[PDB]
Amino acid sequence: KVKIYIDDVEIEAEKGKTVLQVALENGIDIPYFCYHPRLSIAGACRMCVVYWEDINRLVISCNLPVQEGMRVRTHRTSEMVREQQKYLLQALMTRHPLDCPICDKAGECDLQNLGAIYGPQKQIVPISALEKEREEHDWESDFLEYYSNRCVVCYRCTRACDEVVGTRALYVEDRGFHSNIVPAVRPMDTSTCEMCGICVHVCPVGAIISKPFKYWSRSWLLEKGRTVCNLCPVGCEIQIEYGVGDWRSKRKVYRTKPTDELNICAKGFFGYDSINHKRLLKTKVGKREETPGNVVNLLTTILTEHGGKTGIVFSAYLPKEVIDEVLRIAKASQAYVTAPQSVDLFKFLDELEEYDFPTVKEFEKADAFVFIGDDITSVATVLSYYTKKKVYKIGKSVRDEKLQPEEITYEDLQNLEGNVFVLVTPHALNGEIKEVATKLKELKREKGFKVIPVPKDANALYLYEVLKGIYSDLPAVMEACERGDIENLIIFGEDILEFYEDKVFEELKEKLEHLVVVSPYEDGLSEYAHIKIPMSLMGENEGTYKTFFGEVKGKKFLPWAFDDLAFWKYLGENFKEEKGLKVVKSSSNLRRRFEPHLYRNNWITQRSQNLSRLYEKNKDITVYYE
Amino acid sequence: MKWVNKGTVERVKQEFKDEVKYYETKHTKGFEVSHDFLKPLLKFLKERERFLHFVDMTCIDFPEHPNRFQGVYILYNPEENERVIVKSWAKDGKLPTVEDLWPGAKWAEREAYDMFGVVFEGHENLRRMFMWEGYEHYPLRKDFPLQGIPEVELPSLTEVLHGRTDPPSHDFELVHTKLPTLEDLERTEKARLKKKAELVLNWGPLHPGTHGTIWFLFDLEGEKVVQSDVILGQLHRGMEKLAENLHYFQFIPYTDRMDYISAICNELAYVETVERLLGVEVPEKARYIRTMFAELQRINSHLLWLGTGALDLGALTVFLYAFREREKIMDIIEGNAGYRLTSCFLRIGGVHYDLAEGTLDVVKHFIKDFPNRLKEYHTLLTRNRIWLRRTKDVGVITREDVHNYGLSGPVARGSGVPYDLRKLQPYAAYDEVEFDIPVGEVGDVYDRYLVRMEEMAQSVRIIEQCVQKLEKLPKDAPYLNKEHPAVIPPKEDVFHDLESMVKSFRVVVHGEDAPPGEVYFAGENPRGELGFFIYSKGGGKPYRTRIRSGALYNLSIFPKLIQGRTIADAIALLGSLDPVVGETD
Amino acid sequence: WGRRNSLWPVTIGLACCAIEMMHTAASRFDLDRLGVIFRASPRQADVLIVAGTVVNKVAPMLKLIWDQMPDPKWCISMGGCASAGGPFPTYSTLQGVDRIIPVDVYIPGCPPTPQGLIYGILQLQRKIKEQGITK
Amino acid sequence: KRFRGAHGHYVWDGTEPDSLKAIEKFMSYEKAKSRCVACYMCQTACPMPTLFRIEAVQLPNGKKKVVRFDMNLLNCLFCGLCVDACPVGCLTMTDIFELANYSRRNEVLRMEDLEKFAIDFKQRRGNEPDRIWPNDEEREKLWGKIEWSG
Numbered sequence A: 001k002v003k004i005y006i007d008d009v010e011i012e013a014e015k016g017k018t019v020l021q022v023a024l025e026n027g028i029d030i031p032y033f034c035y036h037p038r039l040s041i042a043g044a045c046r047m048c049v050v051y052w053e054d055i056n057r058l059v060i061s062c063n064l065p066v067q068e069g070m071r072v073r074t075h076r077t078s079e080m081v082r083e084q085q086k087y088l089l090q091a092l093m094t095r096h097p098l099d100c101p102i103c104d105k106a107g108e109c110d111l112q113n114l115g116a117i118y119g120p121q122k123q124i125v126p127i128s129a130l131e132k133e134r135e136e137h138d139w140e141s142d143f144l145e146y147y148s149n150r151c152v153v154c155y156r157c158t159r160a161c162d163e164v165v166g167t168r169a170l171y172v173e174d175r176g177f178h179s180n181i182v183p184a185v186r187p188m189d190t191s192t193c194e195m196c197g198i199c200v201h202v203c204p205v206g207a208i209i210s211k212p213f214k215y216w217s218r219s220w221l222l223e224k225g226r227t228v229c230n231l232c233p234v235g236c237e238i239q240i241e242y243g244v245g246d247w248r249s250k251r252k253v254y255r256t257k258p259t260d261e262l263n264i265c266a267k268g269f270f271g272y273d274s275i276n277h278k279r280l281l282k283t284k285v286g287k288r289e290e291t292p293g294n295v296v297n298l299l300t301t302i303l304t305e306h307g308g309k310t311g312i313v314f315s316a317y318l319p320k321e322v323i324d325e326v327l328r329i330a331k332a333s334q335a336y337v338t339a340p341q342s343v344d345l346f347k348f349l350d351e352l353e354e355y356d357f358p359t360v361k362e363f364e365k366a367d368a369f370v371f372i373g374d375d376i377t378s379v380a381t382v383l384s385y386y387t388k389k390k391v392y393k394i395g396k397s398v399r400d401e402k403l404q405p406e407e408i409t410y411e412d413l414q415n416l417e418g419n420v421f422v423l424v425t426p427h428a429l430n431g432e433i434k435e436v437a438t439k440l441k442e443l444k445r446e447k448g449f450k451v452i453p454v455p456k457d458a459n460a461l462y463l464y465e466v467l468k469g470i471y472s473d474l475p476a477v478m479e480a481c482e483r484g485d486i487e488n489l490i491i492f493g494e495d496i497l498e499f500y501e502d503k504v505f506e507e508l509k510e511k512l513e514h515l516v517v518v519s520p521y522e523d524g525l526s527e528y529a530h531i532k533i534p535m536s537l538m539g540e541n542e543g544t545y546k547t548f549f550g551e552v553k554g555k556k557f558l559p560w561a562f563d564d565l566a567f568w569k570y571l572g573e574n575f576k577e578e579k580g581l582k583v584v585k586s587s588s589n590l591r592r593r594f595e596p597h598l599y600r601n602n603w604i605t606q607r608s609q610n611l612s613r614l615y616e617k618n619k620d621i622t623v624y625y626e
Numbered sequence B: 001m002k003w004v005n006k007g008t009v010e011r012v013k014q015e016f017k018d019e020v021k022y023y024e025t026k027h028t029k030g031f032e033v034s035h036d037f038l039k040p041l042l043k044f045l046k047e048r049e050r051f052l053h054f055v056d057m058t059c060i061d062f063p064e065h066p067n068r069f070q071g072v073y074i075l076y077n078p079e080e081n082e083r084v085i086v087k088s089w090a091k092d093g094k095l096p097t098v099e100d101l102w103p104g105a106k107w108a109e110r111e112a113y114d115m116f117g118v119v120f121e122g123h124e125n126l127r128r129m130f131m132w133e134g135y136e137h138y139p140l141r142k143d144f145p146l147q148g149i150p151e152v153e154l155p156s157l158t159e160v161l162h163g164r165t166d167p168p169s170h171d172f173e174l175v176h177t178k179l180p181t182l183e184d185l186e187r188t189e190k191a192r193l194k195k196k197a198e199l200v201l202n203w204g205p206l207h208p209g210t211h212g213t214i215w216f217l218f219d220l221e222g223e224k225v226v227q228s229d230v231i232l233g234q235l236h237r238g239m240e241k242l243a244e245n246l247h248y249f250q251f252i253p254y255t256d257r258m259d260y261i262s263a264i265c266n267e268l269a270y271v272e273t274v275e276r277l278l279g280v281e282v283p284e285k286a287r288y289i290r291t292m293f294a295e296l297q298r299i300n301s302h303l304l305w306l307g308t309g310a311l312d313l314g315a316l317t318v319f320l321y322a323f324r325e326r327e328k329i330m331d332i333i334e335g336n337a338g339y340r341l342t343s344c345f346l347r348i349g350g351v352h353y354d355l356a357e358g359t360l361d362v363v364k365h366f367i368k369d370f371p372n373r374l375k376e377y378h379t380l381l382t383r384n385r386i387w388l389r390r391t392k393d394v395g396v397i398t399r400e401d402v403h404n405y406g407l408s409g410p411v412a413r414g415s416g417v418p419y420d421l422r423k424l425q426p427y428a429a430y431d432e433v434e435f436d437i438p439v440g441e442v443g444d445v446y447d448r449y450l451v452r453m454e455e456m457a458q459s460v461r462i463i464e465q466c467v468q469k470l471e472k473l474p475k476d477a478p479y480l481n482k483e484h485p486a487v488i489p490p491k492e493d494v495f496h497d498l499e500s501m502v503k504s505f506r507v508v509v510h511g512e513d514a515p516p517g518e519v520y521f522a523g524e525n526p527r528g529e530l531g532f533f534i535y536s537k538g539g540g541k542p543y544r545t546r547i548r549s550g551a552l553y554n555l556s557i558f559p560k561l562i563q564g565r566t567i568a569d570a571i572a573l574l575g576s577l578d579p580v581v582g583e584t585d
Numbered sequence C: 001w002g003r004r005n006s007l008w009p010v011t012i013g014l015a016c017c018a019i020e021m022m023h024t025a026a027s028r029f030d031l032d033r034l035g036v037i038f039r040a041s042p043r044q045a046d047v048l049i050v051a052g053t054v055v056n057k058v059a060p061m062l063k064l065i066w067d068q069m070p071d072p073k074w075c076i077s078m079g080g081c082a083s084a085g086g087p088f089p090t091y092s093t094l095q096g097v098d099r100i101i102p103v104d105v106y107i108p109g110c111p112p113t114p115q116g117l118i119y120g121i122l123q124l125q126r127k128i129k130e131q132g133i134t135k
Numbered sequence D: 001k002r003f004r005g006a007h008g009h010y011v012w013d014g015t016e017p018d019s020l021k022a023i024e025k026f027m028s029y030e031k032a033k034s035r036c037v038a039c040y041m042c043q044t045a046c047p048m049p050t051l052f053r054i055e056a057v058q059l060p061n062g063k064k065k066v067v068r069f070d071m072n073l074l075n076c077l078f079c080g081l082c083v084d085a086c087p088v089g090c091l092t093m094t095d096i097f098e099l100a101n102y103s104r105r106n107e108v109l110r111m112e113d114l115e116k117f118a119i120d121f122k123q124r125r126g127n128e129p130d131r132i133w134p135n136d137e138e139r140e141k142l143w144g145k146i147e148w149s150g
């Protein structure tokens, strides 16, 4: 829409973009530090200088909007720009330590890369490696560490904490050369900070370090892949960094990172270790490993001859493709199908009768937000990064206080006005499920509000779509097991442990003829199983999830992955005609055993050593803002 | 050394109007032609434009293109000192043969078929060059792994003999690439020459001769040779493919292992080429250190050719003297580079270290004696005239064979052609140093022996000039261009400041920031023109590094010389062509 | 220490490691004081010195030379190429000669110095001197 | 003095460079033991990284400790590129060359070995100057008395 010139090269640029943006899009590398596409412009690092021929002056390109016929020059054709790059990089290196041999950022460092390409190439300002100091304060944290001398004070962290996450946990300690980043409240691990790791990722250097990753490897020795995070229903796309077992690094997941969209929470940033914890990667019968073909025969016999006495407990942490294949097999076996979400979510959606599920992008269109139930920031954290309008609240409010929500009553909803988005969490309605659903159903028809159900488990909404009308009540299935109406159980994941304690399954192992547990872990519920079948985690399957970021499909790249979908499809080759189903219902009221927490929301994050430390510190805290 | 002149470009465009496209790069000038016009353009460039001297030809693999293989040709105009490069796409995996235009190009076509799978219609029994008859792959293809396809378990027999079944080293891979059989070797031998005479002489694959690894085939009538062929590959390790997987600075030690007899020369050719691609200036002190050490290697390399050449006819007394002098050159190189044979002295941007204390005193002690000892070898050899007559009339190479076969080094100079890149295409410091180019008149085995002899004398005069220049420089003068981002600074710099450390990390982790483009540069190695054709798509690793061996083309003329002659002259002929199994990649 | 028990090896020069082999035989190091006769015909030799890298194309030919030697024989792999494949983990290089012929002594280096090759021979002699001394 | 022999690991003896002393506060080391901080520069610079095997951990006190460092000399070029890449003054090439042995296993250096090699090399030739050759008597057989100068 607008034509410009960068080193006498004509380039078309859409009006509204900056010279730096246009240059990067066209492969013209301009060194930069403080500009981040997701944050507000700062103009502080000054590394993006370009020579604007039209005004004969050095100007920062990150703040320069494109204008028809403008002519700029970069370091490619301007010595002035080259001299300032050498000076700016030398200035940053003045008190920067000789820490590259042990710094976690080596190989992916903006200062190290830019300093080697555009830097002075030699030391002009002679500072001994032993005098590389800058004012500094311990962040008092077990997960984050700040190295102020490595800091190139760029304010990306401060901007991200204030503009993206909104926790306002950092501040710049005393001005001038020694400006250093400090947590607003220490110890940091129990402050307003949500340990999302965004500050680690936006930092262009190794100033903010992830302690769990410190010294274990080198950035260039890891493999990288991107997929869908399934630890909650948001659907963020994250990058897993792993090793293979060769000379470079161990066969495990070493850390995880968000993309430049900064869509990530602590579960996604520090929960990577749940992928390495006691994995079940082979089919087993008892304690002995068995060939998948033999296990497929056992299951084929169970469902073919005893399907009408078999119950299937789905997991909301399963991708669409597996859910569908298992459900199709169930309908070919005349089995019982259920899911723990039948206790609360399904009852709510049955009464609401019709809901809205817009993408995060569509949140811009809302005028106000109404949070009903739990602390949204603790259930679908990243959503709290996009609810920037007025927020009303009915229910528990702990980390959501960062949004300064206004408490209201159900009677007040009748008076709100204009494109209201109601975000409701059915797992937190305790006995008022039908009443609340009925009230929101009226509101959706009379006033036209958007009623968006926020499940706490990744694919629960899809489970509901595929199980509505045919699902059995979880307590009815368990009651049917005690009565002897159900002799075999195929349980997927540990979603069920949110309603029944372990002992129940220790006894079920004796009562049932066949207890089949499909899990990713060798510990937990699978310890009580007769037949153990592996269940895939993120990065180990190509499964799609119905999330807040749309219908996202993951990527399979972790090499130790067990082919979950291939196994079930193979079993399904033995089931062609649809036979039917059995449904059990019951009015018994099952109470949730534990409330989800920001650092522990499901059986997967529970197996994360990192999040468990964060959870133990903050489990008792209920007030973070006042 | 300029490229295509503006005049010949237009005469080529006026003749191939919509079929050729002139183009320029930072370092090369040439043409892109349509497949059906490749040969007419080459015949035009050679016969009607004087690009008679054949330099090299090879292929580049572009899997993302429909044709997938671009033929690359490089010719030279000795009358004007110009180079041309011609590119063309292969039509259905084929290309036109050029061996009738340049006989020396026959072996280049064999190498290409073995590495890429390109067939040359009309190659006159095209067979694989290095691999055996029946190999199922084309290693230079981008989808072929560098380690091949491991298929057989090949444990260490020494470890099995002691019951130790566990791997002996953390990097020991039990699965290995499949191994051929003695029968497999027999098919490549028989599929090489079609029976023409009585007996099939077989001097290889392994023979007790001087160049034991070089395999020869003679078709004899009693004692006369009618037909003759050579089979290489007894040392093929995948050099060109190893470069595709390494950073530029990492390949320097592999250049030492090409012509292991003159490693510093190999490094100079390679480094001088990479420094052109990256645009790296070399400080003065390093330029003289390169020029001096490159010449000490030429003396050291000619001594080996003379010692092994003398060993071929008894007279072991010359072998001892030649190696007595080689031990002196190695004492200087080892003391400065740190290794006797595989020096690994040059670095991108200069030299590894400065000269070691007292190194100039040792060279001066060498430059004063060596002139007297050269007079010993002249008369100690000519003393026995039983062999002097065995060389003054055989193996004559006409100037037509020099350009048709792409000969270089002493092989070309012995025949009258003063083709010396140290003067025609200067590098390190050969422009600021004065020396002479020895040239012969008959062009026989004797002329090549005499050519190499004065080259040692001329090299002593070059070293003498480098010594006085080095003494006049302060020991403060640089031997490394530390101001360029692609030059790894010495450890002493990194131990001191962050400004140097970040450079070391950048280059070591990501490689040098090479720009896109192509470059062809060659060094006057003791055995000929050692060329390096590097193709860069941008990044720390080259997309293709073709190595043009001057010795390889010097051997391609062997079947022409021994034909119609007696087999007794084969030992003297091969020796006068100074070939090295290592330069056959 | 000094034994009149002579050794008759055949030097198989394949690459750079062969050049250092010639320097050891020359007047600078005297490998004769150790009883090494150095016969050139493999029919009458008992020690196979593989000095250089072994290409897969040469492997069948090399194995033949070995089986063609009298049974009281030993083998020395000079340099890493003949020892473990050296610096060439490629499609055409045989990763160590001990994969087709048992070797008794491995001489590291790229290439080993003439003294390293001599020390390597003493090691072979050390082995033999006490190979006929136990049983 | 410039010979590129068997590799070694210089030890913590007080003569460390500024770069290492600058990061000492982060390391778990012992006096007279290897200086290595496991930066992987040697192996990354090496054209044959498979011959190396380096491992380091993060101790519960937050410091870094090198736990494994092995090199297989039979696949080494003895090129010196790794020593160039060492930023802490740890990796070095000694004068040790008498390493011929009877098994591929005897040609694998562990950390304990790299330390012993360097300690011995520094003990015998640490203060020796950088000369073209260290002894003139051993060279006199071939060269004779050389007229040196300042």
Ligand code: SF4
Binding pocket: A096, A097, A098, A099, A100, A103, A104, A105, A106, A107, A109, A110, A111, A112, A150, A205, A206, A207, B502
């Ligand atoms: S922040 Fe970058 S330049 Fe500084 S020590 Fe770390 S890797 Fe090196």
Ligand code: SF4
Binding pocket: A157, A160, A161, A165, A167, A168, A169, A170, A192, A193, A194, A195, A196, A197, A198, A199, A200
């Ligand atoms: S990690 Fe996230 S929540 Fe914690 S301080 Fe940094 S930006 Fe704020």
Ligand code: SF4
Binding pocket: A150, A151, A152, A153, A154, A155, A156, A157, A158, A181, A202, A203, A204, A205, A207, A208
């Ligand atoms: S800690 Fe990192 S992101 Fe924050 S100001 Fe310093 S360099 Fe920038």
Ligand code: SF4
Binding pocket: A229, A230, A231, A232, A233, A234, A235, A236, A263, A264, A265, A266, A267, A268, A269, A380, A381, A382, A383
């Ligand atoms: S908000 Fe949910 S999907 Fe996003 S990173 Fe956190 S746990 Fe994963």
Ligand code: SF4
Binding pocket: B257, B342, C015, C016, C017, C018, C051, C052, C053, C078, C079, C080, C081, C082, C086, C087, C109, C110, C111, C112
């Ligand atoms: S060990 Fe080294 S010197 Fe010997 S042949 Fe192999 S690469 Fe060449």
Ligand code: SF4
Binding pocket: A101, D035, D036, D037, D038, D039, D040, D041, D042, D043, D054, D085, D086, D087, D088, D089, D090, D091
């Ligand atoms: S380069 Fe030096 S400090 Fe780094 S891993 Fe190697 S020996 Fe250790």
Ligand code: SF4
Binding pocket: D042, D045, D046, D047, D048, D049, D051, D075, D076, D077, D078, D079, D080, D081, D082, D083
């Ligand atoms: S000397 Fe060269 S080949 Fe050997 S470990 Fe060091 S860098 Fe690698």
Ligand code: FES
Binding pocket: A032, A033, A034, A035, A042, A043, A044, A045, A046, A047, A048, A049, A060, A061, A062, A063
């Ligand atoms: S990027 Fe423009 S000022 Fe920092």
